Ligand SMILES: CCCCCCCCCNC(=O)CCNC(=O)[C@@H](O)C(C)(C)CO
């Protein structure tokens with residue numbers, strides 16, 4: 001029986017790297033690396049370089065596609081110094097490490113001949129404010145589709161891709177657990193915009209941000225390991241983030257491995273776990289590429305959508 | 308505020324026709340034309356020719372896209388005498404005339420230089436059998452997503468597009484109101500396959516037939532007119548189809564304009580009307596092109612997805 005997907009294991013995938021140049025320092029990789037992640041330059045070579053190569057084979061191609069419609073509409077040929085922005089979506093659960101994947105991926109595409117203007121945006125700033133969430137009773141549902149201003153989010157990506165000179169996005173504070181007043185992230189006609197989020201790949205009764213993606217990644221892993229990674233790093237933050245007297249969750253810092261584990265499992269169970277199962281996982285089937293990680297965070301298997 | 312769509316009126320749309328050749332006879336157009344439809348060669352010129360032109364600007368482009376992945380995967384360059392099939396979906400309510408739109412569209416792309424092998428398939432044969440529908444209690448829900456073997460339907464389009472030499476599809480009898488035993492529609496590596504159906508554009512928790520479309524059309528109209536067109540042609544069939552003593556609905560032939568109108572409105576109200584409102588219309592937002600028809604069946608407005 002035929003399939004739209006083709007699957008590899010690093011052995012295979014790492015080959016397609018061809019001769020793609022590794023433009024990343026190990027100290028540079030570390031500044032993109034997040035607490036918990038095991039990513040090293042090897043993986044960046046055997047996994048991110050082929051991805052980088054792949055993506056570039058399509059940025060030019062996906063171009064000959066807007067051209068076609070331009071040529072159809074009887075329109076000039078926009079400045080090759082400003083074509084249509086390439087949209088990439090990175091999706092996956094909390095703690096799966098999609099955020100590092102996105103940061104790394106940006107660093108790569110960024111330092112790639114030309115001088116590509118690769119921008120990265122997380123759907124975080126598109127969360128309604130704690131006060132707005134309280135009004136809607138969603139304070140315990142952050143991460144769920146309805147806790148985001150998907151209306152605003154669409155205008156953003158739509159704007160950018162439709163060739164605008166600048167689009168603004170709100171900013172979220174993880175320390176203060178809320179959207180920052182006045183904060184603005186301005187994105188000016190990138191060449192490639194990477195949108196990172198949980199349900200970014202979701203679909204609905206209306207054109208959504210995923211309908212604008214030209215390529216998408218879905219970092220994956222057994223729901224059982226993610227919980228581990230989630231909990232494990234809840235504890236780990238007792239001495240990093242929660243340590244700041246300014247943190248909203250500074251109270252978690254004094255917890256014990258035990259108390260913390262209870263706390264962590266409960267949040268996972270009541271929030272992130274459900275959200276992953278009923279919202280994020282059902283989008284996995286339509287991601288250009290899935291990055292399957294082993295319990296050790298190692299990406300040892302991939303799934304590409306050929307169709 | 309920017310939009311993914313650009314809208315035209317025939318005046319504008321008909322221009323993009325450029326110099327596309329009209330290879331259709333009025334007698335030929337008539338054999339594609341269905342009871343109720345007002346389509347004439349003019350419309351075929353001012354509306355279908357630009358569409359034909361547009362589509363061809365992308366068939367070649369959407370190609371440079373599978374190529375990219377082929378070049379990435381380190382694969383040869385398949386016979387240019389068998390590339391990847393172009394998939395087009397035509398969607399819309401019952402009686403809107405999407406079926407003629409699909410037939411016409413095939414005739415055009417068919418007679419277009421080269422010798423394109425343009426195949427047309429309706430999701431009809433993918434309906435479970437009356438006996439299977441009875442088992443699931445769906446005999447009064449034909450047309451609804453769950454009255455179709457979408458599993459089988461996907462394997463079909465997936466198969467074809469993944470470069471198979473032949474895929475088989477069941478056949479539906481409108482006269483006998485059921486799937487025909489043993490009937491087979493064999494489609495052999497087309498160049499362009501057109502899939503016509505109601506929810507073909509629908510989306511779900513799994514990769515669907517719409518995720519394989521390279522271009523899609525959605526024939527549209529006010530829900531109030533469609534009802535008119537629906538009813539109006541229920542009556543009209545009393546003397547055409549229902550006239551056959553072999554028809555399942557031969558009983559409708561003797562009805563009176565009145566009885567028939569009641570019968571028609573009831574079916575519309577209890578079946579097609581709901582289905583259109585809760586299933587077909589919510590897919591309209593993501594069709595490459597929408598064909599908006601006026602109460603006179605005239606397509607006097609269009610909406611193209613540029614993004
Ligand atoms: C309570 C902090 C524990 C942090 C350890 C894991 C990383 C943060 C995940 N946060 C939680 O799972 C608690 C509920 N808070 C949310 O879902 C939102 O803020 C997220 C999903 C982070 C916005 O993207």
Ligand SMILES: CCCCCCCCCNC(=O)CCNC(=O)[C@@H](O)C(C)(C)CO
Nearest residue numbers: 401402431449450537540541556574578579
């Ligand atoms: C009852 C026949 C009246 C025919 C006049 C309109 C054209 C046929 C529409 N049929 C009806 O609306 C009755 C319920 N039958 C169905 O939805 C399925 O067979 C359809 C939708 C036709 C399969 O595509």
